[PDB]
């Protein structure tokens, strides 16, 4: 594998530092590991594709080394080489994306291609150089059984999940009390709604919670908490829990009242803010706990008190909410996120190619399926893919 | 006749498409030669369900 | 090239004229068929070169280092067959000769062989010198072919205690490379690869049309390729056979070993050298197996080897002009007569 | 070759294996419609991609 | 103009591995190209601006190289050095400036200026070295006519476009049908509205279609596809379409029916998800289609039953809409996005040096304007001028 | 400092370029800077800890160089080396960590640390080397006095302040007329209300402003402006401003009129826009000023003229809004943004050690109180912390 | 490719300039370049064919060189020649045809043919020579990308449109108000009518306006525009545009009051024309609009007066029109034209061999459908199969 990872740094900082003019100095370093590679490969024989709409193809190796003699370059001299480039350019492509498909229960970790399992041979190991590609610096760390650690902008940690619960109901749904929310990507937003505005309830507050687990740790998380629920600010006509009817929802919002965030791990509260809204820093959690509430306000004008009644109907329902999004933090597992095109990758070259569904990943590589299960064996499939694609990326947009 | 020649499943409707209209013209034929097919061919000879 | 200092000194008026000297590539490929020419080429070039190839200096006393080898060499221990080790001498000029012939060999495009004596490993062990640096592909297939086996079986193989079936080698891949395939200590596995893919980089394109397949940054100065074909004997000293055996092999191991803080010095050496002169030739040069070979006794070869000191030889400014100044003639010859030539053949038949 | 007609609207035109938009006919279309076995595509193609 | 990139890369790697103290055997390699390149250019003068408010700087160049001798660095070596690089800094600032601003319909993708137009020359390619500064690294592959491609966090490709459609209206505007969107950068808000909720609509299904085509196409992308359109879902007064009169909007939500999206590439379905929110991948398309409806709902509490009577007036305004977002993408050709600053750079020089209006690009680098028409000239232009705004951002910012 | 730096890149590309397999020549260069290293360490003691939870660990040196004879590296080369780079992370991390907690008013952009302190020594200046890391790149370049500058996305340049302004109101709070907002990070949405919808307004139209002052300059930045403010788009019960009661905000949305956005810097316009929505590029700005307009619908339909009526009560609320993203921006001062994980980097080392509340810094590194009240002090010890987490983060993450 | 051209320029300037008669001297310099030729050929094998109805057939190579000795050429020379030469001739023409049917989507630019393919290989470069044949000329100034450019009389731009508008209608069709138009090939004739002779038009006039958009931009065409529309000077019937009637249109032609023809590109006026009739030049353009008006006579004989009343039936409908037609432009793309085989050739070969339809081109390489629809993918395989059918065209005609 991390053989693989080479051939390209080679390729590019050889499709780079190789041009028209330059000095032989600045490359001699270079020019070396290049033929080095050459050599170990001639004679070796290949094979790719064959799965799915994916072509086969067979490579053969006989190429001549690289004239380390000149003092500076003159354009024939590139166009010699770069016509050798091209075929392990166009090689590489075939060598990704025939790994980039196959996944394995057992081992879904190592090698599986015929392409690659060659690869890792020893013979070849002769040709490692410069892993500061962030994400081969990882693979191997993860090796040696140390600590990793990638960086994510708007992560992808929660699976879509758009619902409610309804701590009070009725079958008229002309009383209602309890949450309805909005799970997805880096983003959560949650509202608390109750039609009797706390007007039955102790010291006039009612209480709200939302909890939300994370499939993985999150460390070093930049977060961005407002007050409000503007997703949920507005009249919708909603299907019933059990679907046999549609309920109305007509808000009015209020802000919430003693908001506390807390951002656990393994159950112990490891950040915690209360009402602080805008930027807050949550190191290490696994878990994300909104509470908030709704206080029927003591001092109404007339047009506030003439919302809020002492009997039913109940036409104006009172809400509070939060939104919290995950701008930035960092994950010792691969995720998707919002600048990344790995799982892009991925899917595209699967699908692209009629890839069958496989044992291990869900159809499609859908991201809500695959973080909903996110076992260990899906998790170092995707890490293998996602490094892989990496390395097709440093060579092929 | 879109195609080869005259032959009501295909002609037929190739011709008369009556009534339809704010698109493309393929869809509009294919459309036309399709009611015929459909709801017709099957109280006939086809295969599976 | 910084060593050589340039600078002018006398005016030019606008009178001054010369006359192009014409230097055509080619034009005819005699690579492909007049190998009898050839030879007789290569071999011209080859004289030439040694006329050339700056004599050493400060070597080390003859008799001093054969001294302290005897103390070393443990020479007469039972084995029957002394007295073929030492006939290493003359050295105060096998190595000139050595080292003169070696490059010529080069320049001139020429193949050779080894007038080798299967018994002296010593001279053997030098022998894997010679393939450390020296393109093997410019050595006729066969002379490459007794060397390497006397390597690879009358040494490491056993002394190494790996395979103690000696070995069997065809006509198609070499004893030297595929003995890697087979071989589990990566010192000695480098070695492999890369003394059977060190192909003298056949491919030149310098100061406008001068083909002269090239050689390695790596063998160039950066030498290490010694520094590792050292490592590797570093780790060469174990059983299987009669004593008097490992005791002598690798005591004569040694002696390459620490001579190899100057055995470096050599790689430079040629590295410059060829890497110089070579500059200055005008005919291209194909790499072609010459009908002919060139004898090279590993006795010569031994002797530069550890009887090398902190000497430092170049070609004398006035040396290379020289060298280019002929070659030069020549071309302009070789075209013009070409010229001569055909001009009349067409003329001759309308 | 999966010549669909899609009614109403679309039409598609495959290759048997690995699937694949392309140049539908009117032409190609008509007769090898009018007398050959047709099929009452259960899934079309946007479930079958 | 390769030429330019080193110039720069030469500075970087300079005012950067030069410093009191280093050994001197990490920058050997160094060195030397720079020398290189003062020898190229003593015996050269120069000469940018003459264009609008920018000044009309000249140069020349005769300086000496550097020594080669010590181990170390000692402080009197930096500073030596330093006062040479910053007449190349201040020059190169001069010279990106100056053919940054200018445009040409014909060859809009040659070099323009004086100063330039030089560096193309022969006698300077001598001096090119390491390219593996992105955009650099496109410019080549392109100009050996191969595939390009570009990494985008929120690209923009969307021009800003904010309307509506009414499918079925009237002069009072008490029962309209229809959909309203924004359509801007990478995102697309649409609502469909039908004031009579399926009254008398077949099934009690109002069909809604929204349509995108993108002016270049996208590859790669990873989007997030949500429920609802927050942005169409409260009370408006808008401006009828002749722009005579005001109508009312008074949308209560319901989930939309149906929903289907598809990612077409020349008229083909590339794509197609069916009802799936949260994170998707479209791999290559040029076109964005929604498809969504308005179910009437079957069954209704009596508060929703209120809301939908079978006879006008009709009050509460059902609304079905979606959100889509492209977070990241691949485009075969540069576009804006919100991350780079290329289009700031370019658009703030231009601004800075009141550059007049020219022939390519339409007034203030618009980028509404230039994105709708995305002629090849352009694209040509605004590529030429984005790797240069690159190549500047190396050294200043 | 620098040297600090140095350590890094070292240990980087180390644990990166050093790999089972590599030829020797691809790091000969690197080679001897590292040894360098080792020698002028060895013999020299250091203290790293000694404040709230942190650990006084003790770190002493005694290490043998590196080898020289090599043309690839075999794997018992790397693990006999690995072993010292295990001892130098180990010891950066507590050595990063240790200055990274210490604050200083007087001189708080120097070194602190006992740690520290003894590296600026002068023995030790030589290692400085390969300086390519952005932030270090800005951290010399600060110390000769020039052109510093950053790039952020999606900038966190406006504390959180979420409020209103009543231009007119009275007791009942059933005719108000004013606006209110939500400034946060690099966003801005501002709605100006009207509840009688400008009937004795001036030409039936009610002037709103909204001015945000930025506490540093941001230039090149590449912004997204839109009408309306969603977040203000939604009935609401608001405490009124002098907390004894509550008011009632039941919006109804109108197109901004007059739309006027001013990006100035000093008092001077830089940058104008008029009613350009979509992508706008803002170039050099302190202060951003955004006037827009309700002007009352001169015809309307019957459904929108029973919302305004010519005498109260006035129950549909007039409202107009803006909505103003910054993407991307370039600043000379350091900032938290939506990307860098440097404020939460530091923020959880001193959470984690329970660092005590120093001098310098608000509580809890909170980045609204930070960015209020902006002072050198504060920038200065952010600069310095935020380029020692971007030195830790190449090597622990 | 490049290679393929030269092939083919040998033959011809062989066929040509080698017969009975000549001096030696006139093709010494040819002579040479042939015998090159043949040496890089013999040995290697190739094959044709397999597609349709396309045979295959295999050729090989084993030919004697040229008597470079004569003063001059006996008949028995030539015999001897051009018995070679035919075997390349039937050579050549099957590898065309080979390459000139398959067509591609990703690569629809680079070689097909397992014929041509080979040919692209480097050791046969060794032939390139004379590129003079505008086509190739403009092959390679693309490869390098740089600005290309073609000839063409009468240009084939417009796709075949041939229809109406009703701009005031009503069931009867008894006075109707609209356009009507032809646009095909390089001509547009566009009609004005209105059966009422604008008897209630503001100033007596009615305003009409025709726009074409090029698919492609022309440069430097030559145009005539004259006034009247004699394609739509004739009484007709004519399908309504709901297709379920026909109505009557009976003309009676009035001049062409304030034309006005604008050649627009990228939306800017490039060049404009008022009431000028002739020939006119449009430099640069991607969209024509014509503006003409139909002003009622203000003075009449009897005779004109008796053909418009102030009342309905409107028995002679009022038509004003024009005719443009574009002699001949420069396109940066190929195009079918009026004097050019390209098109007929390229779509020929695929008839004559029945060659299904592909992935690429319409069926029957349908002109119309090709650039109405005219993507890059199209655009690059008809510029190659175009450029071969012009190599082809040099011997087989
Ligand atoms: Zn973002």
């Given amino acids: 594998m991390d053989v693989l990872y080479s051939l390209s740094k080679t390729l590019k900082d050889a499709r780079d530092k190789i041009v028209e003019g330059t000095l032989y100095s600045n490359v001699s370093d270079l020019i070396q590991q290049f033929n080095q590679m050459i050599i170990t490969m001639n004679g070796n024989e290949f094979q790719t594709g064959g799965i799915g709409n994916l072509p086969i193809r067979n490579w053969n190796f006989d190429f001549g080394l690289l004239g380390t003699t000149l003092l500076n370059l003159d354009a024939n001299y590139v166009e010699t080489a770069r016509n050798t480039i091209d075929y392990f350019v166009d090689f590489v492509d075939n060598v990704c994306m025939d790994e980039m498909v196959r996944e394995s229960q057992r081992n879904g970790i190592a090698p599986q291609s015929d392409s690659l399992r060659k690869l890792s041979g020893?013979?070849?190991?002769?040709?490692?150089?410069?892993?500061?590609?962030?994400?081969?610096?990882?693979?191997?760390?993860?090796?040696?059984?140390?600590?990793?650690?990638?960086?994510?902008?708007?992560?992808?940690?929660?699976?879509?999940?758009a619902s409610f619960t309804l701590n009070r109901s009725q079958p008229a749904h002309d009383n209602?009390?309890?949450?309805?929310?909005?799970?997805?990507?880096?983003?959560?937003?949650?509202?608390?709604?109750?039609?009797?505005?706390?007007?039955?309830?102790?010291?006039?507050?009612?209480?709200?919670?939302?909890?939300?687990?994370?499939?993985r740790v999150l460390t070093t998380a930049t977060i961005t908490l407002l007050p409000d629920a503007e997703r949920f600010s507005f009249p919708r006509v909603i299907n019933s829990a059990d679907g046999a009817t549609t309920w109305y929802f007509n808000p009015v919002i209020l802000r919430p009242n003693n908001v506390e965030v807390e951002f656990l791990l393994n159950g112990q509260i490891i950040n915690t803010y209360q009402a602080?809204?805008?930027?807050?820093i949550a190191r290490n959690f696994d878990t994300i706990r909104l509470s908030f509430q709704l206080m029927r306000p003591?001092?109404?004008?007339?047009?506030?008190?003439?919302?809020?009644?002492?009997?039913?109907?109940?036409?104006?329902?009172?809400?509070?909410?939060?939104?919290?999004?995950?701008?930035?933090?960092?994950?010792?597992?691969?995720?998707?996120?919002?600048?990344?095109?790995?799982?892009?990758?991925?899917?595209?070259?699967?699908?692209?190619?009629?890839?069958?569904?496989?044992?291990?990943?869900?159809?499609?590589?859908?991201?809500?399926?695959?973080?909903?299960?996110?076992?260990?064996?899906?998790?170092?499939?995707?890490?293998?893919?996602?490094?892989?694609?990496?390395?097709?990326?440093?060579?092929?947009? | 006749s879109v195609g080869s020649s005259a032959s009501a499943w295909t002609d037929v409707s190739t011709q008369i498409t009556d009534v339809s209209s704010s698109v493309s013209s393929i869809s509009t034929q294919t459309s036309t030669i399709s009611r015929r097919l459909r709801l017709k061919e099957m109280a006939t000879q086809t295969e599976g369900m | 090239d910084v060593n050589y200092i340039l600078n002018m000194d006398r005016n030019l008026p606008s009178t001054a004229r010369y006359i192009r000297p014409n230097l055509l590539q080619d034009r005819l490929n005699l690579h492909d068929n007049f190998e009898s020419l050839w030879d007789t080429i290569t071999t011209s070039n080859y004289i030439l070169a040694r006329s050339v190839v700056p004599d050493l200096k400060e070597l080390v006393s003859t008799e001093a280092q054969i001294q302290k080898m005897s103390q070393d060499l443990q020479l007469?221990?039972?084995?029957?067959?002394?007295?073929?080790?030492?006939?290493?001498?003359?050295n105060s000029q096998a190595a000139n000769d050595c080292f003169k012939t070696l490059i010529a060999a080069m320049l001139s495009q020429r193949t050779m062989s080894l007038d080798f004596v299967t018994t002296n490993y010593m001279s053997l062990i030098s022998g894997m010198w010679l393939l450390t640096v020296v393109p093997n592909d410019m050595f006729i297939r066969e002379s490459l072919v007794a060397c390497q086996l006397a390597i690879i079986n009358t040494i490491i193989y056993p002394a190494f205690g790996m395979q103690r079936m000696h070995y069997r080698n065809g006509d198609p891949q070499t004893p030297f490379q595929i003995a890697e395939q087979q071989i589990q200590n990566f010192q000695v596995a480098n070695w492999l690869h890369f003394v059977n893919n060190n192909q003298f980089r056949?491919?030149?394109?310098?100061?406008?049309?001068?083909?002269?397949?090239?050689?390695?940054?790596?063998?160039?100065?950066?030498?290490?390729?010694?520094?590792?074909?050292?490592?590797?004997?570093?780790?060469?000293?174990?059983?299987?056979?009669?004593?008097?055996?490992?005791?002598?092999?690798?005591?004569?191991?040694?002696?390459?070993?620490?001579?190899?803080?100057?055995?470096?010095?050599?790689?430079?050496?040629?590295?410059?050298?060829?890497?110089?002169?070579?500059?200055?030739?005008?005919?291209?040069?194909?790499?072609?197996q010459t009908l002919t070979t060139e004898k090279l006794q590993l006795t010569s070869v031994t002797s530069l080897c550890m009887l090398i000191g902190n000497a430092t030889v170049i070609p004398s400014p006035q040396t290379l002009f020289h060298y280019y100044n002929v070659n030069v003639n020549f071309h302009s010859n070789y075209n013009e007569r070409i010229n001569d030539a055909v001009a009349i053949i067409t003329a001759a038949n309308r | 070759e999966v010549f669909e007609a899609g009614t109403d609207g679309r039409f598609f035109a495959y290759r048997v294996e690995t699937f694949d938009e392309i140049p539908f006919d009117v032409q190609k279309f008509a007769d090898l419609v009018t007398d050959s076995p047709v099929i009452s595509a259960i899934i079309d193609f946007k479930t079958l991609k």
Same sequence: chains 1, 5, 6, 7.
């Fill in chain 1, 176 to 215: 209602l009390m309890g949450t309805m929310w909005l799970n997805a990507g880096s983003e959560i937003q949650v509202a608390g709604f109750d039609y009797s505005c706390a007007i039955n309830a102790p010291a006039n507050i009612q209480q709200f919670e939302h909890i939300v687990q994370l499939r």
């Fill in chain 1, 122 to 161: 020893i013979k070849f190991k002769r040709i490692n150089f410069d892993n500061s590609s962030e994400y081969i610096e990882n693979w191997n760390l993860q090796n040696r059984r140390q600590r990793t650690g990638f960086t994510f902008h708007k992560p992808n940690i929660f699976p879509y999940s």
């Fill in chain 3, 76 to 90: 007469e221990a039972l084995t029957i067959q002394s007295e073929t080790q030492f006939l290493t001498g003359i």
């Fill in chain 3, 202 to 288: 056949q491919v030149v394109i310098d100061g406008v049309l001068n083909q002269v397949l090239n050689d390695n940054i790596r063998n160039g100065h950066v030498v290490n390729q010694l520094m590792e074909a050292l490592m590797q004997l570093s780790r060469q000293q174990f059983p299987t056979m009669p004593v008097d055996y490992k005791r002598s092999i690798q005591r004569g191991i040694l002696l390459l070993s620490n001579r190899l803080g100057q055995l470096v010095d050599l790689t430079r050496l040629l590295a410059y050298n060829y890497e110089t002169l070579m500059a200055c030739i005008t005919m291209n040069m194909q790499h072609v």
């Fill in chain 1, 298 to 397: 003591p001092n109404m004008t007339p047009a506030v008190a003439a919302l809020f009644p002492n009997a039913q109907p109940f036409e104006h329902h009172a809400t509070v909410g939060l939104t919290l999004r995950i701008e930035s933090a960092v994950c010792e597992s691969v995720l998707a996120d919002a600048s990344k095109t790995m799982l892009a990758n991925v899917t595209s070259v699967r699908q692209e190619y009629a890839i069958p569904v496989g044992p291990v990943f869900p159809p499609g590589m859908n991201w809500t399926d695959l973080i909903t299960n996110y076992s260990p064996s899906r998790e170092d499939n995707l890490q293998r893919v996602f490094t892989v694609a990496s390395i097709r990326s440093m060579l092929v947009k």
């Fill in chain 1, 276 to 280: 602080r809204f805008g930027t807050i």
